[PDB]
Design a protein around this ligand. Structure first.
Ligand SMILES: Nc1ncnc2c1ncn2[C@@H]1O[C@H](COP(=O)(O)OP(=O)(O)O)[C@@H](O)[C@H]1O
Ligand SMILES: Nc1ncnc2c1ncn2[C@@H]1O[C@H](COP(=O)(O)OP(=O)(O)O)[C@@H](O)[C@H]1O
Ligand SMILES: [Zn+2]
Lengths: 97, 318, 629
DNA sequence: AAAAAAAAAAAAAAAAAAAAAAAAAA
DNA sequence: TTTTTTTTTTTTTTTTTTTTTTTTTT
């Protein structure tokens, strides 16, 4: 399990950031590291929490994201173009070239 | 435990305002204990009314508050003068500038004590909105908090951006301050800048600056000691008329300017320019319009501008 | 089943009000329903004054006094009206509708909140100090019996998770053990905001009072912290659900981390007796539920031409036509000052701006103009800054020395309510895509002068400390005001000797403007006369060719253009750069000067509303550069 | 009437270690 | 001037134990 805060660049200047929880299953563990900036494709879900209903006072639900795809964007400004999860990886014809 | 003025109050206010010399009477009333120093009392009486305030769409808001700085030899009676003007004014705060937080005069986002929550607490400049704020020990105020006053005396607003809160408040107050020099005397030979230990812009932006001097004079020393001992010896001053008159003049009255003020003001400024910055003329206008609010009127004339220029040139004399 | 009679009268009266008002015969509310049908909206707006004239307030006062009990009938009547006049708004791709009231006659403060208005329709005002996330609230629940597998739907919930009691089939006997069908259930947006009293309503000595306002539906995120907002809605009361028997063991009978007040231990009157409570005591507190919120404190040409009206469109195109327009614009800037036309021209060029370009290799070319204005005191240098901050959008004002920890770039501060390191905003950061007006630029701290070495050119701030590492964004133009060293300008020393800035920082300023006053008998008379023509007539003293709004519209229209360079313009540019480099002799002139000349040429071209650049523009930019060196 | 299960009851806080600022001086 | 000096600021609770006394449930 990991926690994603909003990136400082995306956050409007002077406002508090928001955070969410992400569940990483097998084959996706230890890919992301604490401190990096990441892009996650996943499914947005809801669940019932007793404490959340007790504190707020209304039947509100908790949300969490089950991660499907992970792409690293730490230091990358070429995200404007390019296709794929890793732009530093090659195919067979590219190695032959 | 421990407003809504009646018509009779209006009538008595009118008949008192019909006095031949209203200037000197409330000159002596504000500080009964203070002997001599009539000129600083004149300036404070003019400050307590303030020139008219205006904010037109194109040019924007123009200030109508008078700022006064008292400084000089260390054992005069400036602190008692400030504590006198504290009570007369309706809404004001008397806090020294010796220490406290760097934003202690403005908003400071603080954690609530009773509940683990967030509270926005305003400072002393915001809490003196629409009145006169008295600062004591101006020379001990820290280099980092000084800049705060700079935005207060320039734009009359304070902005806070902390803990996810970005907002602006309103200061719109008047600054009366008292300071002390370095050493036991203010030697006239050296100029003002070295003694007072204050940045040139901060001293410059004050509308009136008064120097209080103490020289060993037999007549003055005897006269001072005489009335001091007479006060200690056990044997024309209104009590609350000033507060009601101040409120009436501040809440209902708005003077205007006529060409009679034009003719005197332009030539007076030019004659002063025969090192008077453009700040000087906007200082004369404020003082003249504040004098016009006194001796209750609805328009300025020659007497008000003459008194204003006399005051601002007697200030230059020191 | 027992039914109500007054509720039926209110329901039919609301239907009549919706169907019949028509006062502008326009059918304003039917026009609104048609607009919702075409735009697919989910909320209606009803004005109180409009309702304040039908039935002489008999319906309005009935709705106001008992809004809580009359809302179900109002929605029921709205459903019939929608069905009769627009069936398409009866189903989604049913839309849970909302009714928004506004324009109430009187407003209340937070300290007028008493328990005798609970359930009534009110309007309040306050300053927002905290907002939360947009959480989903359970509106219409759906369950399935564990044994029968029968489906129950539309189980209303008030303040806690409520499951059904009797199975749909009386043959089944089941009191519990249901399974929520989270997919079939309907949800809604939910937000909690904290507000406090205004600065004027606070007494001389007071600890500010607070309140909890609930925003729901389409009203989320419309209130931002630090702003002053007027809310309107219904005053409700919220019980403590923890002692109402919440299903899970997670509540654990009021687990606490802090100590409750001993003063109100037994003093807070709690009611007992109810079977659900048991031997417990139920407690209440007052909160507010809001239905309407108000606040009381694109370079694409085709889309731009759509918004403006026909009269505005014709006026703008007639404005563009005249060839004297440029000479007029420099006169419209800051009409409340005397002289300094060059400063006005520079400010206008700064506001128009230059084009931003990106190379295939990924390096960004700057398109922001920085101006520095210097001179001896009392030269009206601080009036220009106020005019810009009042007239330019997304602009901020600041001084050299700053009291804040994040003085001008950024600071790293721990979370007040979280377990992470956050980043505060300096004046440079709070001005992204805007102008930052710096005053008293001389007395800056060296750790800030070195910090601005990145913001002026790369337009970024990059920090790396123990807590956080980030590359922030500061794409801001800078207008700076500075005083000469020593107090007064010397008319034989250069800009360098009189100023204190270093060559790195000095070379990053596009324009330098030295403004000097002179003490002669005649000009002083004109200046005094001009400054004193004000204070008698606040509006007729100054007369510019264009008002503030016309200039503000023209700037936005002109910024849509993006000029290009012609064939002869490039040759003239390289020739002028070579001549300037020759005249310098490399100490003050670099490539940055050529880039700044390109930027100034593009801005001057944007001024004339021309998409092509003529060598006359480069000549003007060259003259402007030469005038400041 | 007699079993099996399920929570309340917490409370507490000084004393030390590490890191970033905002004032002092050879 | 770049060195040393200096205040100071959150850092804290997620855990416990077997009785003793309550409600359900054959
Ligand atoms: N002109 C004066 N009239 C009356 N009392 C005076 C005068 N000058 C000095 N004093 C006496 O000297 C003292 C001045 O103290 P104060 O001015 O409050 O201290 P500070 O110098 O810190 O402002 C007062 O107690 C006052 O009685
Ligand atoms: N047209 C003008 N020409 C010269 N001075 C003016 C003009 N209009 C106003 N002023 C004066 O200039 C002042 C603006 O402050 P300014 O001199 O810019 O402060 P600083 O020089 O410290 O930045 C105002 O107080 C006003 O009195
Ligand atoms: Zn069943």
């Amino acid at each position: 399990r990991v926690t994603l805060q909003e990136a400082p660049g995306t956050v409007p200047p002077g406002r508090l950031p928001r955070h969410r929880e992400v569940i990483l299953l097998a084959d996706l563990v230890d890919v992301s590291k604490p401190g990096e900036e990441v892009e996650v494709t996943g499914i947005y879900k809801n669940n019932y929490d007793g404490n959340l209903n007790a504190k707020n006072g209304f039947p509100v639900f908790a949300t969490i994201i089950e991660a499907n795809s992970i792409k690293r964007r730490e230091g990358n400004t070429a995200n404007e173009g390019e296709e794929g999860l890793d732009v530093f990886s090659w195919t067979e014809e590219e190695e032959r070239e | 435990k421990v407003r809504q003025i009646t018509d009779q109050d209006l009538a008595k206010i009118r008949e008192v305002a019909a006095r031949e010399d209203l200037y000197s009477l409330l000159a002596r009333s504000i500080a009964p204990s203070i002997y001599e120093l009539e000129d600083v009392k004149k300036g404070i009486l003019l400050q307590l009314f303030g020139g008219t305030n205006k904010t037109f769409t194109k040019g924007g808001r123009y200030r109508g508050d008078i700022n006064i700085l008292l400084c000089g030899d260390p054992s005069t009676s400036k602190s008692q003068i400030l504590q006198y003007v504290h009570k007369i004014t309706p809404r004001g705060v008397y806090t020294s500038g010796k220490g406290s937080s760097a934003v202690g005069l403005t908003a400071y986002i603080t954690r609530d004590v009773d509940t683990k929550q967030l509270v926005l607490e305003s400072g002393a400049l915001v809490l003196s909105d629409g009145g006169v704020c008295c600062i004591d020990e101006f020379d001990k105020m820290s280099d980092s908090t000084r800049s705060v006053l700079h935005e207060v005396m320039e734009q009359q607003t304070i902005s806070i951006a902390k803990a996810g809160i970005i907002t602006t408040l309103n200061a719109r107050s008047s600054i009366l301050a008292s300071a002390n020099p370095i050493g036991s005397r203010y030697n006239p030979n050296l100029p003002v800048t070295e003694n007072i230990d204050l940045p040139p812009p901060l001293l410059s932006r004050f509308d009136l600056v008064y120097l209080v001097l103490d020289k060993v004079d037999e007549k003055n020393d005897r006269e001072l000691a005489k009335h001091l001992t007479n006060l200690y010896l056990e044997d024309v001053l209104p009590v609350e008329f000033l507060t009601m008159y101040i409120s009436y003049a501040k809440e209902h009255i708005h003077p205007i300017i006529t060409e009679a003020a034009k003719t005197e003001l332009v030539r007076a400024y030019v004659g002063m320019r025969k090192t008077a910055t453009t700040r000087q003329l906007e200082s004369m206008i404020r003082l003249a319009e504040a004098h016009a609010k006194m001796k209750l009127k609805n328009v300025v004339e020659l007497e008000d501008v003459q008194e204003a220029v006399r005051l601002i040139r007697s200030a230059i004399k020191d | 089943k027992v039914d109500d009679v007054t509720g039926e009268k209110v329901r039919e009266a609301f239907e009549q009000f919706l169907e019949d008002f028509s006062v502008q015969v326009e059918k304003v509310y039917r026009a609104q329903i048609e607009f919702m049908k075409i735009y697919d909206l989910n909320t209606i707006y009803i004005d109180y004054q409009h309702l304040s004239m039908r039935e002489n307030g008999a319906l309005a006062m009935a709705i106001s006094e008992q809004y809580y009990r009359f809302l179900p009938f109002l929605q029921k009547g709205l459903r019939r009206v929608v069905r009769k006049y627009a069936p398409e708004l009866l189903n989604t791709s049913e839309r849970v509708f909302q009714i928004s009231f506004f324009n109430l006659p009187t407003v209340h403060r937070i300290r007028d909140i008493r328990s005798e208005k609970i359930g009534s329709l009110l309007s309040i005002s306050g300053t927002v100090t905290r907002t939360s996330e947009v959480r989903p609230e359970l509106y219409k629940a759906s369950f399935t019996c564990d044994m029968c597998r029968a489906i129950v739907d539309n189980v209303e919930q008030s303040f806690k998770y409520t499951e059904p009691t009797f199975c749909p089939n009386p043959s089944c006997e089941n009191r519990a053990f249901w399974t929520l069908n989270v997919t079939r259930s309907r949800f809604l947006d939910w937000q909690k905001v904290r507000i406090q009293e205004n600065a004027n309503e606070i007494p001389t000595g007071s600890m500010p009072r607070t309140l909890d306002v609930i925003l729901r539906g389409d009203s989320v995120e419309r209130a931002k912290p630090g702003d002053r907002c007027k809310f309107t809605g219904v005053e409700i009361v919220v019980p403590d659900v923890t002692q109402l028997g919440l299903p899970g063991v997670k509540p654990s009978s009021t687990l606490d981390t802090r100590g409750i007040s001993k003063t109100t231990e037994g003093l807070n009157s709690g009611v007992t007796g109810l079977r659900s409570l048991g031997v417990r005591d139920l407690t209440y507190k007052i909160s507010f539920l809001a239905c309407h919120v108000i606040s009381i404190g694109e370079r694409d040409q085709e889309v731009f031409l759509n918004s403006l009206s026909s009269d505005e469109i014709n006026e703008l195109k007639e404005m563009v036509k005249d060839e004297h327009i440029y000479d007029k614009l420099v006169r419209s800037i800051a009409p409340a000052v005397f002289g300094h036309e060059a400063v006005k021209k520079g400010i206008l060029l700064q506001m128009l701006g230059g084009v931003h370009k990106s190379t295939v290799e990924g390096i960004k070319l700057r398109g922001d103009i920085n101006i520095c204005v210097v001179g001896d005191p009392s030269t009206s240098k601080s009036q220009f800054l106020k005019y810009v901050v009042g007239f330019a959008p997304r602009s901020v004002y600041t001084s050299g020395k700053a009291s804040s920890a994040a003085g001008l770039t950024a600071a790293v501060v721990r979370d007040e309510e979280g377990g992470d390191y956050t980043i505060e905003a300096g004046a440079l950061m709070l001005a992204d895509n805007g102008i930052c007006c710096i005053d008293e630029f001389d007395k800056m701290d060296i750790s800030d002068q070195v910090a601005i070495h990145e913001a002026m050119e790369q337009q970024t701030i990059s920090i790396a400390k123990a807590g956080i590492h980030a590359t922030l964004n500061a794409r801001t133009s800078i207008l700076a005001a500075a005083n000469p060293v020593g107090g007064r300008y010397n008319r034989k020393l250069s800009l360098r000797g009189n100023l204190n800035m270093t060559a790195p920082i000095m070379s990053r300023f596009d324009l330098f403007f030295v403004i000097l006053d002179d003490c002669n008998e005649k000009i002083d008379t004109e200046l005094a006369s001009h400054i004193v023509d004000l204070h008698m007539k606040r509006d007729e003293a100054i007369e510019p060719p264009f008002s503030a709004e016309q200039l503000r519209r023209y700037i936005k229209y002109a910024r849509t253009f993006k000029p290009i360079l012609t064939k002869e313009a490039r040759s003239y540019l390289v020739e002028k750069y070579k001549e300037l480099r020759k005249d310098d002799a490399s100490y003050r002139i670099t490539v940055r000067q050529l880039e700044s000349m390109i930027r100034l040429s593009e801005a001057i071209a944007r001024a004339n509303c021309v998409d092509e650049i003529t060598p006359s523009f480069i000549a003007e930019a060259y003259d402007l550069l030469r005038q400041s060196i």
